Amino acid sequence: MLKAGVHFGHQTRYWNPKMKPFIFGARNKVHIINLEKTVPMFNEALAELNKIASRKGKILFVGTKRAASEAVKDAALSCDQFFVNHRWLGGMLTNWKTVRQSIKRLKDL
RNA sequence: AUGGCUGUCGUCAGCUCGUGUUGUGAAAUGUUGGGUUAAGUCCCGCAACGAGCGCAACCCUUAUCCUUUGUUGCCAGCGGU
Numbered sequence: 620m621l622k623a624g625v626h627f628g629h630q631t632r633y634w635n636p637k638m639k640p641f642i643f644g645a646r647n648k649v650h651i652i653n654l655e656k657t658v659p660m661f662n663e664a665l666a667e668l669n670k671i672a673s674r675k676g677k678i679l680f681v682g683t684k685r686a687a688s689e690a691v692k693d694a695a696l697s698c699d700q701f702f703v704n705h706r707w708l709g710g711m712l713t714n715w716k717t718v719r720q721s722i723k724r725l726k727d728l
Numbered sequence: 729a730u731g732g733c734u735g736u737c738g739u740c741a742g743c744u745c746g747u748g749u750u751g752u753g754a755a756a757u758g759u760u761g762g763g764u765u766a767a768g769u770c771c772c773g774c775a776a777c778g779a780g781c782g783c784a785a786c787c788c789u790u791a792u793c794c795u796u797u798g799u800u801g802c803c804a805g806c807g808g809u
């Protein structure tokens with residue numbers, strides 16, 4: 620069942636009321652998530668996620684921070700899988716048709 | 729009442745657009761920020777991504793050197809004084 624050795628929870632106060640259902644925490648000012656509920660979402664997650672990787676995988680691994688950027692430009696970068704490892708230029712989906720040519724310049728370059 | 733022309737802030741760094749986003753809306757963002765430039769100059773940052781007019785460059789001149797050209801210009805090495 621549990622696979623996350625030391626991923627436990629995180630984040631002291633700064634919590635978000637909406638995150639009670641998945642919190643069982645306490646230990647020292649910072650709450651532990653609900654290890655026993657995290658996983659039941661690897662079900663459904665990787666499921667409906669796989670259920671469209673076969674329907675034809677088009678993903679986009681959004682993840683940024685000089686502390687994980689290329690730990691995402693990884694076997695994630697590789698497969699049926701796109702990504703963004705730095706500042707997410709805003710409107711890049713909603714303005715893909717202005718940005719599409721921001722690509723044409725990348726390649727032409 | 730005007731065309732054309734001209735002073736002027738000021739060769740100051742400014743003025744805008746599309747698309748995206750935001751607000752009920754006038755509008756906003758972009759162009760609020762951190763540096764730096766002569767500069768909206770540039771670099772980082774950034775719900776914006778991109779662009780046009782201005783900044784800059786392309787023009788004249790000046791400072792070095794090469795090619796060509798030697799009269800009306802030049803005289804280094806020559807012969808004539």
Ligand SMILES: [Mg+2]
Pocket residue numbers: 768
């Ligand atoms: Mg400019």
Ligand SMILES: [Mg+2]
Pocket residue numbers: none
């Ligand atoms: Mg100019």
